[PDB]
Design a protein around this ligand. Structure first.
Ligand code: TPP
Ligand code: TPP
Ligand code: TPP
Ligand code: MG
Ligand code: MG
Ligand code: MG
Lengths: 562, 562, 562
């Protein structure tokens, strides 16, 4: 028959293995909407394009697969910029399909047309391109997919002029190709794999730090066989945590942010193995905090820029992180000459424990519900059947203190962009990935960050998504209000207080469950209540503002343990 | 004494004459926040950076001045992109002040940093530029203002590294320089102005069409001098309508879209003078449905691409629209012999009025409130004491049909980008520019577009803004659903129905007045009620889905009077 | 019949009045070649696309019209970058027509395809754009011409995919539109015009400075009437010098660079009138050496960025420079009472003349011909019938000192880009424009610079172009060798000597008249010889290296006088 370019897009995505798209409708991309309707593909349609974009991210992260986002021309695309920017830095594999002006209505001042979407998207994407001919649609779509999913994973834009989409050709003119890209990643040269193992055996205090790319390939069975052979502790940046949930408990060092007072302990790691973790913000930069200059560092990253960009390393290998762990278990299933790491692993869990006691010792929840305490109520329900998504300022800095101790099904936190509010978006789409697994999603967000996408309680309800939103309400933009007294001066705070409005009143008005809580018990009663029930909820949690997280004081450059 | 890069900016904006900024606080730009506090200059902080940017647009357009927008690094900037794009196409003079990563922490994977902000805004701005030394700030800020304000007016982006903002210097070492740019625009060469007036005299059915740029300089008394002398009617595209409000009633033609039904009456304009109107969406592209190919066209635009871009004109002048009007009055003051236009002007008002009676005659509001009947209820409250702001899909297309009859102090509608939801931001900042002038602002929005910025009721209450928001709620993304049922098929509707949620409840949750009305009486009661009170209000108006606005059928290329 | 997209281009250029192209043939752009050959418009085909690009600049600047460059896809476009860049900063109206890959051969790794040609040209052009439809060619080309030719004049890039160019439509289906854009530019307000004149009347030591845009619009008759009425002296940067050749000699201040030693004379100008000169390289920046801080500045520029960008000004008008000179003569036709400026005019020509003898006084041509003495030889032939083109390092810094006194038909020197070797290109194109005027072109280049485009002697020969090329050969990259010893150290000069080659031998091996000269008499004799002959000539002049252009010392910030 004769199908439209819109249909050609959809066949190609179905051929890849795509089963959900997140989007918001426009006349310009309606041919895709029509084709999805025809091929029984869900198109979760949100209230803001950005929220749909982040929804694709969360699906991609929580799902360990490709996320797809669909936005209309002009305003559709520009509303989509923040999720693209976010997925760019988080290294999140998301295909962004956008409509634009008709080729033939080029340069005529028509509606939603005239802005250079690929130009805009270029410095934010692994690849961005505008389709010039309908026959190109199947192969350009697959190309776009391949680029996003290969290492390092990242966001890709495909600009589908209205003109090309509506247009129609003969089904036989064109070939819908398969996704013919191996699921297995590239492995290091046998020469280096041996040198890195030789180094790890000589190590007295060795550690491994997992990055985002450990989670995208998700090679758990091979990682377990490897830790089970060498017996070395394992840390991760935020994205990496999901991986540490198949590991014995003494071999779990937790969040990379623990390796801080390992110096002040005369116990600083002897060697560091970085698999996908970059010398960015999550690893304490080139400063030496979490990773020590003295230490001999082995860094694996598909992207050779990252190889000792900030510190000098000892060995740097270009390869896929997931494909590397496979090559690691394989070469460690004959060794058997691996030292006992008891005394080392012992202190690792000890130092993490001291921090947990040191914060619980500082926590007074006498007058207003301390935030470190509230996070514990949440900790109580976190296991492999629960994806946790974090947003807000101080509120996610408090969760990190409680997150090393539990074993989550997914954990999705801020990337280098650190854009407040992308929480709803990411969380929503996370739940759609979690529906298959039976996992349930919980968003822990700030009173500020919820305001960005508050309308999404509508989408939650319309699409029947049982996401629980916990709003840690301190009646302010938390992180910034602290900066104002702590970096500027006590009496002068502006543009940061948010002392107005029932967020729970909003959610109830949008059709979701309202809960209001201020005490520890009030909160635990409500969280267990919302979890028991199988529909969307909002919990407005009154927390103190004054308390200063240890992580806030690390990042400006001070010791919270001195 | 010693100053910081932030202070330098604030002093430079004050020497320009700026009295409000719209922003959203982040630590990267806190320096400006602090300097503003010192100088009693208000920063209206919203819930989303987008809403802030659009608020600067609304400030600018309704204020006939520069609108200033301030956003933080990274997510702060990318969230502000929809406002920049809109400002670009609307030709709206807005200065966009963005923070970025520190210069000394360049290329290190730090926080909110690594996205090429200037590159991203390049295709959307008259000028984009990242500041490289703290002493450059005062002259780089002024150069940005001049860039923004010169014709054609447009957005300008100025990236201030955090490094450079926090950074510190001597008061007398650098110079806060003055705003030296003449307010009066450039005039056509007299030989061309004479060609034009000669042409205008010989015309049998002459019209004038105003664009954005007429409203920007706002030379009202020079238009009245010119119309009341040649006696020619005057039309305007959306941005230009504000300018027709101090004009004699007979020589007002209304919105440029009334020139449709002018052919079928053998009364198509003989000559068309276009002052800032571009050929494109507002003026019926190159089709000659509005501007007939037969007519002698005279076009005046600051930007030369624009001159006869889609049609052939007889005269194309590069000049300021504002200054061209001044010359049009100048050259008309001695000229005694202008023909009588009484019969033609009678014909213009006659054709426009037949249109109105034709719509009312086809409008039943018995089963559910007709969107037209609803639009009339609003129009009876519109005079020069009111700025009406429009958003949504079908809802604004209906409102246009009543807007030609009333003389508004401001009318801010969709530009070419047609981004749904920009209504809140613009409407908010419009109310800020309106407070000083004493005028009151109404936003007339659809049920879809309001969901975009619905947390902004928070800003409406925190900041004490008596903005009334009418939601024309047809429980669907109206305009796209009409495309789906009319051009694809009645049973093929997906992703456009919005069958959920109390919007008036949402406003009531943030502390605004809630109204839910459905009949003509109820709504008029509700509107008059909210207007009496100096308070932020939300009117949720239940309106019909089925009716097709005459503009929907015109823009698709059909006759709606057939 | 049916014509080609190539034909559609040529028909449109023809309607603009384009009578010559500069280019270099590729198969992608052959349809334009066929259409030019069909319609007898000459395409001057050079040996390098950069020479073709620059030749178009010279044609534009020397003919005071639009210039058109035509380069093929890929290498054709990239070779064209330096001319586009130069035209951008010189403000030169140049249409760049480029081929690119076939739309339907998109992303297929083909011949000459794949490089984002509009992206690369975006920051270098007023407008860069890829043509998307064969129907579009006529209106897009004219839109391009309008954008290049509007104030401020600058280069435009039009990308014409080979696919769309080969395409064939029906003649009658598309309309080849006229150039309807008034040749007179916009004039200043009459409030401001009068303020400037009253300020000019109150002035005690007023001066006028013409910049690039004065030569573009070329409003000579209006300038003669204006200086001859107020009697104020008049300077110019390099581009502006051509206009000073229709002026009584005492009223000629010459090159703007004379106003240097005017301060230490207590003769620093009271008031400065800037017509299109920008605060920058030619005008001693924001430093106030040439354009004093004490003095009141009145600045007129099409681009408002420029208005007091580096100094504070007293008045700043957005207007076309050509139009402003008109308005000025106009307003001076009634103004009978302009004071006598005899005392000031005399002082001016006196100081410029003293500086001149000050250099001849310190010049010795005994052991090798002095570069200034050599410059004087050339000055003896410069009149209204000669276009002089300068290139090279020291060699042109020497001419400037001799150039103020003589009144040339054209004078084309380096723009802000200051790119060596662009001489042949610009000069060759200059000679083509000069054929209509009867003027002859003479290029003064250095030994390093001729080296860039040396093969162009071949184009001079094949194409019968009697351009005379004087090489001031000091067997080195002069300017950089001087920086090395004068700012770095005596004994450390590397990579700057060019002690090799017969340049005259090269020109003769290509077909042109070869001359070798080292003394004053040899040089004057041969220069006079090649001029009598109506052929292309090369003159290789051995000049001294050790000398030091006063300008070379006026730019590090030091003083070549007191
Ligand atoms: C998109 C974006 N990202 C980051 C910032 C800067 N920022 C970092 S933390 C913060 C306050 C967040 O408040 P909230 O979400 O309530 O969390 P809290 O720290 O108050 O608990 C802001 C404004 C910003 N202004 N915009
Ligand atoms: C930012 C943006 N997103 C999506 C669209 C596509 N679109 C055009 S009209 C329309 C429906 C608008 O709905 P609503 O605000 O309720 O107005 P109404 O239903 O009354 O027409 C949509 C989704 C758009 N033009 N801009
Ligand atoms: C395109 C380009 N422009 C400028 C320079 C830097 N530069 C400025 S002057 C100069 C020497 C010019 O030598 P020549 O052409 O012989 O003139 P001379 O001063 O030696 O007489 C150089 C290399 C450069 N390397 N490349
Ligand atoms: Mg908070
Ligand atoms: Mg609606
Ligand atoms: Mg030389």
């Amino acid at each position: 028959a004769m199908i439209t370019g819109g249909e050609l897009v959809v066949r190609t995505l179905i051929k890849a293995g795509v089963e959900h798209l997140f989007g918001l409708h426009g006349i310009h991309i309606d041919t895709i909407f029509q084709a999805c309707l025809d091929h029984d593909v869900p198109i979760i349609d949100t209230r803001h394009e950005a929220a749909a974009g982040h929804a694709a991210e969360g699906y991609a992260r929580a799902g360990a697969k490709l996320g797809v986002a669909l936005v209309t021309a002009g305003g559709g695309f520009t509303n989509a910029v923040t999720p693209i920017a976010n997925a760019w830095l988080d290294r999140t594999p998301v295909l962004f399909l956008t409509g634009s002006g008709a080729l033939r209505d080029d340069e005529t001042n028509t509606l939603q047309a005239g802005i250079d979407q690929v130009a805009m998207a270029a410095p934010i994407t692994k690849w961005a391109h505008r389709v010039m001919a309908t026959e190109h649609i199947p192969r350009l779509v697959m190309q776009a997919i391949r680029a996003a999913l290969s290492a390092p994973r990242g966001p890709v834009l495909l600009d589908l002029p209205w003109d090309i989409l509506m247009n129609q050709i003969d089904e036989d003119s064109v070939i819908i190709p398969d996704l013919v890209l191996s699921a297995h990643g590239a492995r290091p040269d046998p020469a280096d794999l041996d040198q890195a193992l030789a180094l790890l055996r000589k190590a007295e205090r060795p550690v491994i730090v997992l990055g985002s790319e450990a989670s995208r390939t998700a090679r758990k069975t091979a990682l377990s066989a490897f830790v089970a052979a060498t017996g070395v502790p394992v840390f991760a940046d935020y994205e990496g945590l999901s991986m540490l949930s198949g590991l014995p408990d003494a071999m779990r060092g937790g969040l990379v942010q623990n390796l801080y007072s390992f110096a002040k302990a005369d116990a600083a790691p002897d060697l560091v193995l970085m698999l996908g973790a970059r010398f960015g913000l999550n690893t304490g930069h080139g400063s030496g905090q979490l990773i020590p200059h003295s230490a001999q560092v082995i860094q694996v990253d598909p992207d050779a820029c990252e190889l000792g960009r900030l510190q000098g390393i000892a060995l740097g290998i270009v390869a896929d992180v997931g494909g590397t762990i496979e090559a690691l278990a394989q070469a460690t299933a004959q060794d058997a000459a691996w030292p006992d790491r008891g005394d080392w692993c012992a202190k690792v869990t000890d130092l993490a424990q001291e921090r947990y006691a040191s914060i619980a010792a500082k926590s007074s929840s006498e007058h207003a519900l301390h935030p470190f305490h509230a996070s514990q109520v949440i900790a109580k329900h976190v296991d492999a059947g629960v994806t946790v998504v974090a947003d807000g300022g101080l509120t996610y800095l408090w969760l990190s203190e409680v997150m090393s101790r539990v074993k989550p099904g997914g954990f999705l936190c801020h990337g280098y962009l650190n854009s407040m509010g992308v929480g709803f978006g990411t969380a929503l789409g996370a739940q759609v990935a979690d529906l298959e697994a039976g996992r349930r999603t919980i968003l822990v967000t700030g009173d500020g960050s919820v305001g960005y996408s508050i309308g999404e309680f509508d989408t939650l309800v319309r699409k029947q998504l049982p996401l629980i939103v916990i709003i840690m309400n301190n009646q302010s933009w938390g992180w910034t209000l602290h900066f104002q007294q702590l970096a500027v001066g006590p009496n002068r705070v502006t543009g940061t207080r948010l002392e107005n409005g029932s967020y729970h009143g909003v959610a109830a008005a949008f059709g979701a469950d309202g809960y209001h809580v201020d005490s520890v018990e009030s909160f635990s009663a409500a969280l267990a209540q919302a979890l028991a029930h199988n529909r969307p909820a909002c919990i407005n949690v009154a927390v103190a503002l004054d308390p200063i997280p240890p992580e806030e004081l690390i990042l400006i450059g001070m010791d919270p343990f001195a």
